[PDB]
DNA sequence: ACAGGATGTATATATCTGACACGTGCCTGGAGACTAGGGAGTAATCCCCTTGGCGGTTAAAACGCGGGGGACAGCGCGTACGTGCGTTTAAGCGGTGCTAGAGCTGTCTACGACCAATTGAGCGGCCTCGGCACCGGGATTCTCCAG
DNA sequence: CTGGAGAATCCCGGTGCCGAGGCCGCTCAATTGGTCGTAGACAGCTCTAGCACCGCTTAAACGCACGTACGCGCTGTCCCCCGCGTTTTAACCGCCAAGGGGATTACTCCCTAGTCTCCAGGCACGTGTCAGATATATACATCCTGT
């Protein structure tokens, strides 16, 4: 009786702790491989990629997106919110200088 | 190869946000995150492909990627 | 006379917290690394041998390598 | 025909890092048409000091992690836990280093 | 097909590690991180010293240009300790 | 009967007149004294070219105006029209200054 | 002669004007002190780099060249001074 | 024999206003590479001249609508900031006496009831 | 003797009179222009030097400058600059 | 002679709970490596000045090797 | 605020297993030794130009006050998102196989450095007039209260 | 919902001023024309690794149910910042004046490129073996329900 159910947020905090304690790639390797190949074929058709080049691109994108989500979370907390919304990412990117 | 930006799945973006210390994520976050990731890849990959084209190569080496990242003020260690 | 009385009072107060609260007889020479409290090494071996892994101060669990002698003087 | 056997400039300056290699790279890197004798000694000393600092911090992190082998995670912790070393490498990302574990105080449970 | 030749700071980083942590090893990925770090800081100091020599219309890079480049690039107290180590090495090299 | 403008309208007029204009918005002698104080904190008995002080003033004014633009965007993000020190801190930390 | 507390010389209306150029409508009363602090930090960094450049050149006068190089070092390239 | 051409500047050979010779000299003395090709200063001078022409065209356009027949740093700043592509080329660059681009956030405008 | 200094002032003015025959320029604007030209020259030349170092080339050619222009200049500006540089190099080769 | 012995107790007692390097204020820190006791702000300054060794045995210590101690 | 039930996490032992640390053979890149010539350190001079003071004055800062409009706490709601579960997808791992292109090597030639003579472009100084700064006045436009 | 009054701003015209631009003189660096060396383009070969496919397993993505907590709108209240007038103050301009040191020149010397020979430091490769994941087995720190 009464199956266990964690309250909304504590599981999220446990994932935060787990993924900040760990170092592996958080994006599946084959879809990111395919995405890199699509974005590359728009610049030079019939292109080949070193495997380490794709791992370097994946590391760069994971680091960039993690830092962007750090700034996004700070923007959301600034607006007295705990959820991140697209306007948070827009503000963070525009202050960082992309927009 | 078409329409694999959704291959960067919703749980993957959630995991990236979790590493970034995000407790709650809106449902509209994922599409806009896919867009900004696409923009970032466009910039970095365009620079890497330019570096590859200069070398008269048809293979994008890891050194081209790290040079492209370094030029954008995003120096990466561990690939030369 | 007042200065001597004040000096004796502060000496007694300093001896009060220089001593292990678990024993209150003789000086501390060790700490517990999981509760950040100072105790005496003979009290901690007494608690270790008799199989009570409870801190005298905060009741935090600790083991053999969770405490060590420290150099005061 | 009598001459001294060998004495590397790294050994002369008491440095582990190569003064000769740094000198060659300074000449070949197109920095100036001339490079002084003490410039590679100074640069090797600075590079060795920075290497020793980051390696000591990484080894301390590894020992606190009950690991006797330095991994990129330990290097990342060493960089991010030292503010001067962090802002020296502020625009630098480390492969497989992860992130420094922090959670914003508002995200913690309300304890209600 | 002969064998090529590649240069690295791997053995130097290992010597420094053994003299700072005698009983601690380093992985290959961490060694790559370290080699990239050494190369980056070397090129950074060398470029700053080259620009310093260009600004002063000087044709040579001496220990003073590296002094100034370290004082500029390295932050806070890292800068002054690196200056101390560099001057120590330069003095002991000129002595011997 | 005195005449008063409602709050914000004169502020908008200043925004317009200082975005149309290009002169330095900080008094020259106080900024020069601040520069000299910081410099003597770094190296004593130091001289400054007038062009050097003017370059520092242009750089500082440009940096402060950009910082206030980002701070204003932070304020608008929090559904506010006034800027607060937390807005400046958030903008600076996102820009990487902290 | 030595100089003290000239950071207060960057007065409140000056910060008002700087924020007006930045398109700021309302300004809190605590903005001014934080602006003085961040301006002081920025000036410390830039002036330290310029003084280091001047010391390398064996010079005892800080020229506009030193300021320009110190700014271009910090990703804050300045035009109109050389 | 002494019969030789009087002079022919490489800028005029390439049809450029910018100096191919001075760009070549700056490339040689800049310690960029051990050698500099013949066409490298030509290409670099052409690129620099194109960028100069673009920014000067935009600056003159900005000066014309202010009833000014003389480009001032304000006109250059307006030209660079209006052109988002030149703006992104010179994003981390500040211009002395240029001011800022006039804009106000739409929410800061009066409600006008 | 007398101090001598070089600048792109006459070149910038010739370009201006080519693009805007009846427009002037101020001293401060000319300083802005000279700083811009030196900055872009330094960026392109440094990038070309880095390309030559990466590819082990000991010389900077028009290929290095073209790659540097493609890397640094954004989008359509880079496209036009590459076209202009190629045009000038082909014109110079004939003469 | 009782007061002279009384004063001799003061100098010996107050010396062992004060930081041997700063020597004006009470020890409130302990190193894990060499297992010695110092004061917290002195060990913070030594870590921040990158002199991350014990003041007397020169044992290298990490950031987590030193922490608050409460002797009292 | 306090049990306890469950969930998750932190310590304590076998056990493989590649990766890492050390040993060997080269070999080519640093070291020794010596020359020569230019870069720069040093002494001297001189003339910008930076610093300092004094005085007028006047624009700007500082002060104080009235009030209004924005900040913020609190409330209510409703819906969007988190958590868990069953289902489905495709990522991942390994294994094979093919070959395209990275990488290296030998020719040699055609560019780039170097150098002597020179001359025309480009910079410093002069001077002038006109674009623009400034003053003033009227017309226009924006704001705001009060109907 | 505007009328109208007050205030800010734009536009028009007249006048002076200082700097933008053209001109002149000079000088030094870019040009021309050779030689010579060697950097790289260019063909050829090798073999590394990039790509493609296949199949099995299972981790992970996905779709759905359901609840809840938080994002957002509204209300009140309240107090802090804006507008504005007055007083102070010190910024700013002009002028004066001294001398500090930036900039340039001349001389010399010593420090670094360049060379040649030589050898050993470091790299590529090989190989033992041992932290180290990777399991279980056991003992605490939270999470959440419940009272
Ligand atoms: Zn006891
Ligand atoms: Zn305790
Ligand atoms: Zn102390
Ligand atoms: Zn010790």
Numbering used by the authors:
A (entry chain E): 36 to 134
B (entry chain F): 22 to 101
C (entry chain L): 929 to 1001
D (entry chain C): 9 to 120
E (entry chain D): 29 to 124
F (entry chain A): 37 to 134
G (entry chain B): 20 to 101
H (entry chain G): 8 to 120
Text of the article:
Ubiquitination of lysine residues is a major histone modification that regulates various genomic processes such as transcription, replication, and DNA repair. Histone H2B monoubiquitination (at Lys120 in humans) regulates transcription elongation and DNA repair. In humans, H2B monoubiquitination is catalyzed by the heterodimeric Bre1 complex composed of Bre1A/RNF20 and Bre1B/RNF40. The three Bre1 proteins share a C-terminal RING domain, which is required for the ubiquitination of H2BK120 in humans and H2BK123 in yeasts.
As the sequences of RINGA and RINGB are highly similar (with 86% identity), we were unable to assign the orientation of the two subunits to the density. Thus, we created two atomic models of the RINGA-RINGB complex bound to the nucleosome based on the obtained density. In Model I, RINGA and RINGB bind to the acidic patch and DNA phosphates, respectively, whereas in Model II, the two RING domains have opposite orientations. R953A and R978B (Bre1A and Bre1B residues are indicated with superscripted “A” and “B,”, respectively) in Models I and II, respectively, form salt bridges with H2AE61, H2AD90, and H2AE92. R955A in Model I and R981B in Model II also form salt bridges with H2AE61 and H2AE64 at the position of the so-called variant arginine type 123. K962B, R979B, R981B, and R982B in Model I and K936A, R953A, R955A, and K956A in Model II face DNA phosphates. In this model, the lysine residue closest to ubiquitin G76 is H2BK120, and the distance between the Cα atom of H2BK120 and the carbonyl carbon of ubiquitin G76 is 8.6 Å. Thus, when the wild-type Bre1 complex ubiquitinates H2BK120, the catalytically active RINGA should bind to the acidic patch.
